[PDB]
Amino acid sequence: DNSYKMDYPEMGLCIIINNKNFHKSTGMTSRSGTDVDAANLRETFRNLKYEVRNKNDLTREEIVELMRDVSKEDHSKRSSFVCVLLSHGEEGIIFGTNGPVDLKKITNFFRGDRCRSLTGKPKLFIIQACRGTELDCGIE
Amino acid sequence: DNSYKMDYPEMGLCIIINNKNFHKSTGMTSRSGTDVDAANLRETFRNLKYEVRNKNDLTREEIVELMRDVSKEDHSKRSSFVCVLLSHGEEGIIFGTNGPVDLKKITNFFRGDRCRSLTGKPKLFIIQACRGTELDCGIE
Amino acid sequence: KIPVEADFLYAYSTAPGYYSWRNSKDGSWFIQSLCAMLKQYADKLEFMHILTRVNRKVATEFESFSFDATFHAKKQIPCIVSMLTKELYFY
Amino acid sequence: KIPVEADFLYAYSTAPGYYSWRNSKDGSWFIQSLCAMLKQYADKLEFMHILTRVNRKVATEFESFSFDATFHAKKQIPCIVSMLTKELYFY
Ligand SMILES: *[C@@](=O)([C]S[C]C1=[C][C]=[C][C]=[C]1)[C]([C]C([O])=O)[N]C(=O)[C]1[C]C2=C3C(=[C][C]=[C]2)[C][C][C]([N]C(=O)[C]([C]C([O])=O)[N]C([C])=O)C(=O)N13
Numbered sequence: 001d002n003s004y005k006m007d008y009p010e011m012g013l014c015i016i017i018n019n020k021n022f023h024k025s026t027g028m029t030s031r032s033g034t035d036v037d038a039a040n041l042r043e044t045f046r047n048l049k050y051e052v053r054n055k056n057d058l059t060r061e062e063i064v065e066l067m068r069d070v071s072k073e074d075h076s077k078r079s080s081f082v083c084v085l086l087s088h089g090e091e092g093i094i095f096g097t098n099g100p101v102d103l104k105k106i107t108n109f110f111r112g113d114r115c116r117s118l119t120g121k122p123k124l125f126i127i128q129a130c131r132g133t134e135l136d137c138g139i140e
Numbered sequence: 141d142n143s144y145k146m147d148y149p150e151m152g153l154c155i156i157i158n159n160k161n162f163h164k165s166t167g168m169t170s171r172s173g174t175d176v177d178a179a180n181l182r183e184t185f186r187n188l189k190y191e192v193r194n195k196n197d198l199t200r201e202e203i204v205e206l207m208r209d210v211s212k213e214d215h216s217k218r219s220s221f222v223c224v225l226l227s228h229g230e231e232g233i234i235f236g237t238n239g240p241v242d243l244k245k246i247t248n249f250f251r252g253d254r255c256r257s258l259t260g261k262p263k264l265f266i267i268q269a270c271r272g273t274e275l276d277c278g279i280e
Numbered sequence: 281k282i283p284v285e286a287d288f289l290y291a292y293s294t295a296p297g298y299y300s301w302r303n304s305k306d307g308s309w310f311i312q313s314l315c316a317m318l319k320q321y322a323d324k325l326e327f328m329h330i331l332t333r334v335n336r337k338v339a340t341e342f343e344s345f346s347f348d349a350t351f352h353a354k355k356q357i358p359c360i361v362s363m364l365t366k367e368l369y370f371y
Numbered sequence: 372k373i374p375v376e377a378d379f380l381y382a383y384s385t386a387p388g389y390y391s392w393r394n395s396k397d398g399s400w401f402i403q404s405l406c407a408m409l410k411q412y413a414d415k416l417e418f419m420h421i422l423t424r425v426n427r428k429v430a431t432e433f434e435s436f437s438f439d440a441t442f443h444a445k446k447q448i449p450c451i452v453s454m455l456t457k458e459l460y461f462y
């Protein structure tokens with residue numbers, strides 16, 4: 001087979017972390033319009049038969065704890081895993097409402113040897129964020 | 141159209157930079173077996189109708205100069221561009237026989253606004269190199 | 281036995297080192313396009329191909345509008361990072 | 372008008388932050404597999420799909436052998452970084 005097995009009893013889990021408001025300490029502006037995405041995404045993955053769980057304005061601590069908890073659930077009856085991150089960021093980092101958290105720290109919970117029930121199953125991470133402050137002016 | 145136009149008079153250029161030997165200063169071991177790749181790659185892209193140009197043991201200076209020169213050629217009659225880098229490296233970097241060179245510096249010559257004759261055409265970079273010293277022990 | 285870093289896929293809204301754009305009324309360009317492409321294609325295209333459609337849409341149909349000249353008329357190209365070992369079909 | 376960082380594609384032999392393996396007799400795992408997959412598939416599969424085949428091959432059929440226990444029995448997963456806007460067919 002050259003395609004993943006998507007016929008498990010459950011399509012899989014889909015976590016959406018929607019960060020819209022940030023502490024003055026961070027210095028990040030409010031992320032207007034992010035709710036539309038969150039609503040859009042939620043509906044799109046429900047039609048795909050994913051068990052969607054929306055979360056809004058989480059601190060970097062909460063994000064790590066949540067992922068940890070999700071990595072500990074049993075995914076044996078699930079086909080895949082999808083995690084959408086809506087927030088601010090810079091290369092290799094995404095922001096919790098209270099500050100930066102390394103992207104490596106979040107995904108590491110889902111490595112083949114860390115989350116055994118997802119081994120050999122597709123783990124998709126969709127990130128809506130800044131990976132720097134460089135501007136693409138376009139051409140032609 | 142949802143696929144690139146590959147019917148230009150020429151499939152395109154394919155540069156292979158094969159670094160096998162390094163100056164003691166670098167501290168890198170000889171890259172045994174790299175010639176097989178270089179030979180293999182050369183034959184594979186010739187059958188694909190690419191104009192292959194093999195280069196061995198280049199200094200970081202030579203690599204930059206070469207790319208600069210290649211970015212200045214006229215690719216109007218070419219469909220794409222392929223550059224294979226065989227060498228040592230670390231995240232975001234590849235080694236010339238005489239030392240490290242940032243990967244950003246090499247590709248920047250081919251940006252849409254830098255190499256006009258390749259605008260809207262596929263630019264493929266194949267890199268055989270270390271992106272760190274972390275080891276994947278495997279699972280299951 | 282397989283690599284512990286395999287079967288991962290990172291769909292980035294933008295390229296490394298760049299800003300990502302969002303419209304306060306419609307949402308981010310990347311998410312709009314992604315949801316739209318998934319709506320009309322999840323039933324027939326393989327996932328990479330759907331993501332490629334997203335790249336074209338975001339790169340072709342969007343361009344920032346800002347009263348601030350420095351953030352005006354900017355573009356964006358999403359970035360697909362695949363370490364998958366098999367094709368992905370949602371059906 | 373399009374993004375100046377578009378239509379680029381980086382086929383990496385390995386994942387970010389990891390070693391890439393090479394055999395002194397046959398060549399690197401990544402290149403062997405890439406050339407092989409291109410040989411039998413360049414005439415029918417779209418480029419991303421060919422690269423996905425490379426990922427499976429490298430991740431499934433290779434495993435380092437070393438007298439040095441620390442570099443023995445290690446694995447590797449190639450990394451595809453696509454910013455292409457269209458499907459790629461070599462035919
Ligand atoms: C990034 O997170 C910004 S990271 C900034 C940073 C972080 C750490 C250290 C230094 C700098 C976001 C992505 C996100 O939130 O989803 N990008 C932006 O917020 C971008 C870039 C930018 C914006 C704004 C001001 C300055 C830089 C505010 C609004 C802007 N959007 C618009 O102007 C749109 C454009 C359009 O759709 O035509 N127009 C409207 C009416 O909404 C914007 O997206 N960002």
Ligand SMILES: *[C@@](=O)([C]S[C]C1=[C][C]=[C][C]=[C]1)[C]([C]C([O])=O)[N]C(=O)[C]1[C]C2=C3C(=[C][C]=[C]2)[C][C][C]([N]C(=O)[C]([C]C([O])=O)[N]C([C])=O)C(=O)N13
Nearest residue numbers: 171227228229269270390391392393394395434435436437
């Ligand atoms: C990387 O470039 C190494 S970057 C090391 C570094 C750079 C900067 C700062 C700190 C460290 C290469 C890739 C390349 O050249 O194509 N990787 C290696 O050379 C790997 C990892 C490694 C190796 C060796 C010794 C120590 C670490 C030498 C040989 C080894 N290959 C084998 O043992 C193979 C395995 C197999 O095929 O089963 N066996 C034989 C008989 O060849 C190797 O590839 N590398």
